[PDB]
């Protein structure tokens, strides 16, 4: 049984070098391959495992020096398997590949940091093994920016960073399989402690085989409440606990510097915020109900995780010198009718009087659990309201008032123990955990007020101007009239928008957050929003916020919301703060990156000029997709990449779904996550980035000229674009297959223009093109280069001064090394037309050009030049990525067309050619990740 | 503050060398103590913090040198406190003491063993560096002996190990001071890891002394001497802390260790290797607050406790097992059981599909848990429920079948692996813990059952079964066993003792036999007793009578007790009725108390080989029992001799020990605590099946016969013959103020009236203990020893052959001489200055030289020149802690002379910063804290 040695050779091939000392990724990538072609081996037969490895040996050899004799060599095998086989071979790469991205995250966790690898610039921040920890930052802060620790401390406490959680454009991973994956990661780090004993390491060994065949063993679109369980299991898996040690760091970082304080223990420096079951833009599978449902849910979630909680805490609170108000309270408390503490006392006495008073905490989260499940399961209680938690005053009150007795008897230091963990987290994740955005398209509410008008004998409110319409809007808003009753004809969208405003009028507004308008291009659908959610009796009325998303739509944006806040009636209801949402992915969609990178750039600077003017605390929500969207260490340097005042001191940016496992799987990983957007967000706020040159400014309008000129030349003007679209990639086979949680289209008719971001990205991501995240850079450089002989040494000083443009940069590079040009090539010439093959060869071409101009403009030479280690982790998916990939277009021509016969194989072992496709469409998403 | 500089010259006094070169027990001590005294200083002021500094030094030195001067220093400064500095010095001690055994017990777990440091012999098995681990026991088995693998293989599946968990004799602590000794424990051991991070070592540190300061500020005395019920609930923290996770572990070490020497099968997942049972809210033998009620009460908490844990278990076990291959049985299962109505795991899903269907039947199982535990939670808060009794698991195989079903489905399909992970830890589980955990043994006098049937007879007119012989006796019981109608009703002059009694059987008769074990009869002396407690069983509608456990504890009684025994297995009734078993019990603590330590140590092992004798004319399989105190009561490394060391063939492979109160935290606090101890009794079972100690020579009969006599009179004559002892007793020795102190959860005196004889046995122990004099272990072992040296000159090279060769003897003494370590004959002599009259202290001076020959005496038969020559790691930490404890003597002391003396006025000392009845208890709590066990 030598293959161990034959793929211990492949892998050293792969990635020969070692990136440092501690590099045990060859190694431990070595192990888990091991252990799980053993184990398929076992279940489904020595002739499987034999093929399996045949197809890794030749992908590594590819992925070596991509010879393309290799990939033909691949497909004679894949293809001449009958489903069954395609299948078993099909599941064996997604969880080879799941396995070194197991292997990759205990790598990133454990790789030890370099304090001599640091340059002392802003490049440091592009990688988690040289960017600044907290307190690096505070004493760049003290050091270099000549800020005092009290500045510092100060920005902290007012510091907000809030985290959105957002759907899977996939498959959002299942509860169990990220247990599952964790213990694999315990196994595999212990597994290497260098003192371990040999009984321990063998039963260490059997348990990480179990694991892995666990996982392996294990085979509707889920509901969205079932996505939104499995989206939420990251608090128990590594958040909830994750958080006050983080904050505990804090103040240790603060106590480093002179400052006595801690971080006070209500400052919410840390908030999270959820889409799931919120979104409805083109979605209509996101009912009322489902709202209400992730909303109880939510509730239900964290009921349960302070009840858990609470008990330890009632053990550490066994004190008896106290407060005369706690001493007050205990005495009230133990005058009323003992179920739930049973098995540890028969009743909490009068000498304990921090456990009685937090045993009535516990017997009331008891309540509020009880509560919300009967809601959930039912729609009505009989559990008083009264006997729960409504509001977080309620809940905090009762914890402070524990703190203040303990710190008024000499006791804080074991206040600060629990109780502060416990008061931290009620601050951090409220009564729902997250709070849930609502999101629906701005020509519903066009709709809903016009049928509302129809009915009033008042006109239509579609045809009226855009002034016109604000003017009625803003006389209704000042008016004391209602609008409408339940007289009223309403289609089923309208009414869809009617439920979910009084479904939202019937929760607790601790539940929600922001009503973000897609597709808003105006005043007049705030208002909108605004309005409607006055007249169904929203009495605690959310936050509304404007998505911008064409390119148009950025550049009139700032007018627009400068119009909003000089509205008497807006500026009273917003307070001096406003939230406007830009969309990275959308935007690319509508005219190509660049162009909507520099737009997202001047747009951001101008809503901060308006924002100023009128005195209000600008909020920029950033969407999904863009260079805000990766993974890791880059994100520091992409925060600290945003203009001048863009932030101050209120972050809000969406987790990709893509990106959330190897960002909160693990526990060092998430601490660090949470560690650099609270670190990136203070600096920016005291040490802006450099004001772009002017030459820059200029440059970089001529550049999104040229760019949004290709791009929509490409996209859109060629007549026999979509055609080709449709078969060189499986976009139509990933909107028909029952896989992303809503639908492509928005209107089933329409083009591109009407293809939502997230397929469109995906359809070119899966067949390593990824077209949509570079296409125009190419001619912007050439253009520029062209022009001027010296363009290309401002474009080289720019990407080594100016880290917006380093970021960016930076991205398309990433998505160029997850990109092979031959792959690409592979699907033209099985799934494309002959008449179209040409097409092919030519956007191929531009990919060439725009990787070779990416390079010039990075000083680089290679790939990645900057990050081997980064190199190495892509490098090392990417042999299981295109066995995925051949599989995947052999398995689409074999779908489309029924007359492309093939010799078949015999069975293997095991003691439907769509669930293959399946497969490798989520493989290769799962091993692409991010990418723009 | 430099004030550390001289805690730690005073330390590295006391502890001078390294046991080792992982010895970080200094250390240890040094940053807990040291990180106190600072909690001490900002919460009680700076003179607080240095008077205890000042107390501490002078305990250490006199540590020492033993120099009396220190003790007079000592006192000079805690007569001088008002009660109030009283009160904080003593609590200061006694939480110092407790770090001082936290930092013991890291110490203890994280030392490295020496492979070279073995000897090759029985000694080995003494001490914790150098025993035998389970595969170190296979291999000791396979290559010595020449058994197979498969012999080993076949003993563990037989083989049973129960242990027993009594109350124990003062502060049962608190489930929460438990856990924060955990807490403390941890940050010690996070922060001397070699690798730790600046920020870590700083919050770490920051943790430690939190959790510090958290159990200083914890009070320790009020509320009530806990109820039955609280006890119970605080005895069952070590399920929660380490026995729930820890058992699973064990047994896949043993499969491990199984594997190591060729075996390929695991120890199969219903083996009963470990079992639990309780004596917590069961034992009445004088103690009127454990009611019927209370027997009920813990029986229904321990199902809750169970279900609970099960509860939460199921959950994760839901999680991993998703599979979709399953069997053919498995399958149509899960589609029965997907016909119903789903309400326990809606956050995780809205409801199982079919095609997971191990998800389907661990829901389903899942959801009888809840249904169990809401049940006996309202059983017990009420005295009914309403939940059906076919919606819960009454026995154990409703239970286990699913379980069992789900591992031959995943076995069937080549998923073996899977189903041996968190499916076999669960199968494991519940096996050893059943639906209770534990099972509550019930024990009472043969009195009361005497007392039952005389009003029995009385009311029939058939004369007074008392009056009657004991032949007679069994005559008439042996005429109503076997007849066909009832003894007696309702109309029943019942006085309230045998109310008690016959409460007692019907709440056994009402609840399920899962939660019982063994009916335990104390001052059993004769077959009548026994056949009284099964008849009194049959006739109150016990539908599964308990198993009877005769307790012989007087020497007579052991003497006359495989005669009885016999006489019992002989009568049919009996012998078919308990079907080849039989469990008898005898008692350490109780025959010391009646003669002396060395008689009751040699007539116990000489009246085990007569029960097994008897047991095999018979074809009986015999479980002896083991009562608290003796040579089978130590801590640690010292029980694995101590089994090893027990008479041929007494064990068997079954084994049932009582784990005592005042070691249970040393045994069970820890996880590797907890390995090792579950891993030595399994050893030792094991070896001590398969390979006896030697059988002894029979001059060493013959000369322990005679010590035997000469012992026991030396120590009736001093206990039982001297006129005023009763009247020193009470003098030189808090017994009275323990007794009348709400401490001890029953009472001493069984009879108030009567003197050492009816004192029991724990208070008569514990009253010796406090005082650092320990008379009721070794009196009598220096008039025998010397006796024997005399009579002939060659005595003393045997009992050195003995102590070298015999097990047996090998433990007694070694046991004498660890109490030896904790004794003081100083401290004794200040309690007698203080609280003993002129004329009595010759007396107490009499009894303390014997206190110096036997010492010297034992040494010589040792062949040791200082105490515990051979194991100074034991000798380390006990040095530690005495330092510790002779500031609690003292304050005890002179606390009792206040209390006694209301004339002893004292020049008093102004309080420092912000009662001595709870001085006293604190003292007492403190030294009994220190000082552990000792016979
Ligand atoms: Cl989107
Ligand atoms: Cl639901
Ligand atoms: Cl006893």
């Not at 449902?293 to 509730?299: E, I, N, P, S, Y």
């Not at 308006?610 to 340097?637: I, Q, S």
Request: hydrophobic share 40%; charged share 30%; proline share 5%.
């Amino acid at each position: 049984l030598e293959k161990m040695a034959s793929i211990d050779v492949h892998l050293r091939q792969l990635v020969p070098g070692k990136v440092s000392e501690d590099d045990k990724l060859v190694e431990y990538d070595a192990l888990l391959l091991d252990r799980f072609l053993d184990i398929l081996q076992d279940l489904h037969g020595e002739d499987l495992r034999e093929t399996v490895q045949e197809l890794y040996e030749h992908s590594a050899e590819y992925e070596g020096k991509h010879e393309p004799k290799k990939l033909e060599e691949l497909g004679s095998v894949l293809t001449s398997l009958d489903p069954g086989d395609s299948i078993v071979i099909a599941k064996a790469f997604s969880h080879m590949l799941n396995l070194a991205n197991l292997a990759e995250e205990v790598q990133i966790a454990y790789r030890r940091r370099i304090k001599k690898l640091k340059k002392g610039d802003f490049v440091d921040e592009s990688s988690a093994t040289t960017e600044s920890d907290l307190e690096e930052t505070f004493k760049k802060l003290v050091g270099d920016l000549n800020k005092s620790p009290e500045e510092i401390f100060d920005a902290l406490k007012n510091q907000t960073v809030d985290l959105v959680l957002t759907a899977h454009p996939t498959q959002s991973v299942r509860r169990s399989l990220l247990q599952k994956h964790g213990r694999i990661r315990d196994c595999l780090a212990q597994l290497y402690a260098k003192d371990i004993t040999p009984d321990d390491k063998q039963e260490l060994d059997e348990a990480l085989q179990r694991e892995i065949q666990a996982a392996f063993r294990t085979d509707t679109p889920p509901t969205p409440q079932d996505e939104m369980r499995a989206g939420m299991s990251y608090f128990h898996e590594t958040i909830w606990k994750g958080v006050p040690k983080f904050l505990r760091r804090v103040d240790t970082a603060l106590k480093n510097i002179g400052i006595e304080e801690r971080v006070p223990y209500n400052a919410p420096l840390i908030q999270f915020s959820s889409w799931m079951g919120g979104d409805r833009d083109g979605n209509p599978r996101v009912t009322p109900e489902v709202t209400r449902d992730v909303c109880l849910l939510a509730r239900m979630m964290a009921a349960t995780m302070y009840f858990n909680q609470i008990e330890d805490l009632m053990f550490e609170m066994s004190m008896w010198r106290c407060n005369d108000e706690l001493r007050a309270r205990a005495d009230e408390v133990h005058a009323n009718s003992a179920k739930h503490y049973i098995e540890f006392w028969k009743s909490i006495p009068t000498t304990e009087p921090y456990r009685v008073i937090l045993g009535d905490v516990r017997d009331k989260l008891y309540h509020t659990r009880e509560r919300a499940h009967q809601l959930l399961s039912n729609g009505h209680s009989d559990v008083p309201v009264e006997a729960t938690f409504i509001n977080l005053e309620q809940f905090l009150e009762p914890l402070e008032l524990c703190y203040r007795s303990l710190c008024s008897c000499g006791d804080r230091p074991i206040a600060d123990g629990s109780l502060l963990d416990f008061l931290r987290q009620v601050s951090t994740f409220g009564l729902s955990l997250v709070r849930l955005d609502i999101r629906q398209e701005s020509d519903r509410h066009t709709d809903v007020l016009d049928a509302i008008t129809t009915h009033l004998d008042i006109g239509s409110y579609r045809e009226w101007s855009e002034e016109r319409r604000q003017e009625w809007l803003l006389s209704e808003l000042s008016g004391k009239r209602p609008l409408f009753g339940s007289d009223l004809p309403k289609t089923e969208e309208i009414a869809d928008v009617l439920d979910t405003f009084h479904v939202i009028a019937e929760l607790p507004a601790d539940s929600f957050g922001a009503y973000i308008i897609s597709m808003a291009t105006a005043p007049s659908d705030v208002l909108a929003v605004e309005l409607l959610q006055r007249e169904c009796r929203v009495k605690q009325p959310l936050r509304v916020v404007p998505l911008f998303e064409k390119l148009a739509d950025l550049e009139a944006a700032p007018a627009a919301v400068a119009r909003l806040f000089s509205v008497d009636w807006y500026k009273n209801r917003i307070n001096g703060k406003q939230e406007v949402m830009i969309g990275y992915s959308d935007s690319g969609k509508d005219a190509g990156r660049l162009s909507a990178a520099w737009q997202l750039y001047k747009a951001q600077e101008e809503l901060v000029k308006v924002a100023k003017e009128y005195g209000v605390k600008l909020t920029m929500f950033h969407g999904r997709g863009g260079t805000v969207g990766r993974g890791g260490g880059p994100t520091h340097l992409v925060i600290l990449s945003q203009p001048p005042d863009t932030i101050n001191g209120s972050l809000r940016v969406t987790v990709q779904g893509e990106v959330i496992e190897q960002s909160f799987g693990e526990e060092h990983l998430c601490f660090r996550t949470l560690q650099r957007f609270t670190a990136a967000t203070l600096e920016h706020g005291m040490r802006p980035p450099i004001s772009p040159k002017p030459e820059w400014r200029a440059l970089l309008d001529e550049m999104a000229v040229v760019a949004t000129e290709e791009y929509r030349s490409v996209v859109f003007q060629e007549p026999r674009f979509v055609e080709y679209f449709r078969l060189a990639t499986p976009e139509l086979e990933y909107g028909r297959m029952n896989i992303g949680s809503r639908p492509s289209k928005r209107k089933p008719s329409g083009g591109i223009e009407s293809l939502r971001a997230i397929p469109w990205i995906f359809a070119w991501t899966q067949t390593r093109f990824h077209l949509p995240v570079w296409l125009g850079f190419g001619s912007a450089i050439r253009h520029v280069i062209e022009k001027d002989v010296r363009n290309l040494h401002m474009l080289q000083d720019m990407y080594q001064h100016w880290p917006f443009f380093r970021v960016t940069i930076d991205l398309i590079e990433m998505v160029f090394a997850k990109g092979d040009p031959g792959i690409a090539a592979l699907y033209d010439k099985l799934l494309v037309s002959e008449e179209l093959w040409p097409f092919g060869e030519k956007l191929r071409a531009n990919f060439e050009e725009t990787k070779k101009l990416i390079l010039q403009t990075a000083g680089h030479k290679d790939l990645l030049e900057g990050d081997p280690y980064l190199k190495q982790r892509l490098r090392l998916r990417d042999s299981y990525i295109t066995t995925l990939n051949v599989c995947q277009a052999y398995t689409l021509k074999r779908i489309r067309d029924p007359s492309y016969h093939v010799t078949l194989r015999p069975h293997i072992s095991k003691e439907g050619l769509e669930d293959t496709l399946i497969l490798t469409m989520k493989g290769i998403a799962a091993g692409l990740q991010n990418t723009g």
